[PDB]
Amino acid sequence: MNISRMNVDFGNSMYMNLIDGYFFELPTNVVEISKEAAEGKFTSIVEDPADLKDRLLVSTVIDETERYFLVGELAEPELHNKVESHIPYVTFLAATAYYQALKGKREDNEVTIEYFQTMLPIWLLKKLDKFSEMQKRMASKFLGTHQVKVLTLGLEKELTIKVEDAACRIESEVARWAIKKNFDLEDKDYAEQFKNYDVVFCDLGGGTDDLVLLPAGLKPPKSRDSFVSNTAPFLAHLEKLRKEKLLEHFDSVRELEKFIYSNIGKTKMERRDGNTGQKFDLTDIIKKSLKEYTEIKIAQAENTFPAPKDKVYKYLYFGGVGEVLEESISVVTEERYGRDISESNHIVAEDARLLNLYGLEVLSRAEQVKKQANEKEAQ
Ligand SMILES: Nc1ncnc2c1ncn2[C@@H]1O[C@H](COP(=O)(O)OP(=O)(O)O)[C@@H](O)[C@H]1O
Ligand SMILES: [Mg+2]
DSSP states (O other): OEEEEEEEEEOSSEEEEEETTEEEEEESOEEEEOHHHHTTTOOSOOOSGGGGGGOEEEEEEETTEEEEEEEGGGGTTOOOOTTTOHHHHHHHHHHHHHHHHHHSOTTOOEEEEEEEEEEEOHHHHTTSSOHHHHHHHHHHTTSEEEEEEEOSTTSOEEEEEEEOOEEEEETTTTTHHHHHBOTTOOBOGGGGGGTTSOEEEEEEOSSOEEEEEEOTTTOOOSSGGGEEEEOSOHHHHHHHHHHHHOTTTOSSHHHHHHHHHHHTTSSOOEEEOTTTOOEEEOHHHHHHHHHHHHHHHHHHHHHHTTOOTTOOOEEEEESHHHHHTHHHHHHHHHHHHOHHHHHHHEEEOTTTTTHHHHHHHHHHHHHHHHHHHHHHHTO
16 A cells, blocks of 8 residues: 555644545554563454554564553553654554555555654743754654564454655644645735744644744744743643532543533533433533633733834634634633734634644645656656
8 A cells, every 4th residue: 555645743642644635533552562461452353444543452572672652541440751652653653554454455565655744742842952952862663674464353464564764853843834825835815924933833732732923924933942842731720620510420531521522612511421411501601611721821922022112912822722712712812812813813813723734734735836846857
């Protein structure tokens, strides 16, 4: 099987990837188990490749040792350095094997990837004096030939995966390409509102909040000071909310997190007991808590890059939390700056959760065009 473009967002909450324009995502969990635990782990055969996604049991050889991993939703009932940790690498292998099983032939045991692309979080890059070298090591982790075994009964095989070319971009910053261009590499009219304003890109996530200062026209950051990461996370805010106000309704922060993004955006946020179908309106409690958090976010962003009083900044909010907070952001910015500045200067991205990934996708299409241009000039 041949893959032209593969773009990966190793999130803290979800692994997400686009493979030749095809989207799917997996829970980030990777649990390492022993050989005997993996045997007699999985009991009944599966035949439909789609079922593999929730049943990812793989092995791969690491430092000449064959090790066994539960990946994604199968790892569920059981901030890492993205470069030196095996977790992203193992997730990538399982993801690729899943896509092969879903879209490819049973007897095809080989996958070639022309162009692999991922990225690194700002909090990790800022620890080093040079971003480029860490990004190069990240890319090198995926370049070349790898093998993985699928041990899920019914879909067993050892897959050889060959990555011909690989690159690593900067999270949050790279998302600007999803605003600048569409996948046909046309300039977006949507980006014109940022033609004359420096923009603070606010990547609001579950575990970090990363901000990039983009000079007018969504141009590259001027220096290292234009990249900032914060850690007083959204998940801690939810788990404090759960233990204080909602202990009755959620036994884990993951449950509360799932209920919120599933239910934010409608007028009533209703919790549904499965046994008796009884109803609990949790709307007031939740929007109130989200507004609190948003007030902290707006203030952080405002204070992160001290806008000089002869400059007007605009703010573009994204990430999965940005998506959830969209309503809250509109309310809070209107209270704080007035309606006019709220609407024109505080923008929540559409596809906020997927913007980084989409930025990779745009770069991979430009790269793909560049390649074909180069190869035809080669005569
Ligand atoms: N459809 C969705 N699936 C999963 N999470 C979502 C979804 N929509 C919004 N979210 C929110 O996205 C957050 C994860 O944000 P993300 O940008 O992935 O940051 P991180 O990678 O740090 O978790 C979750 O806390 C969740 O509340
Ligand atoms: Mg992210």
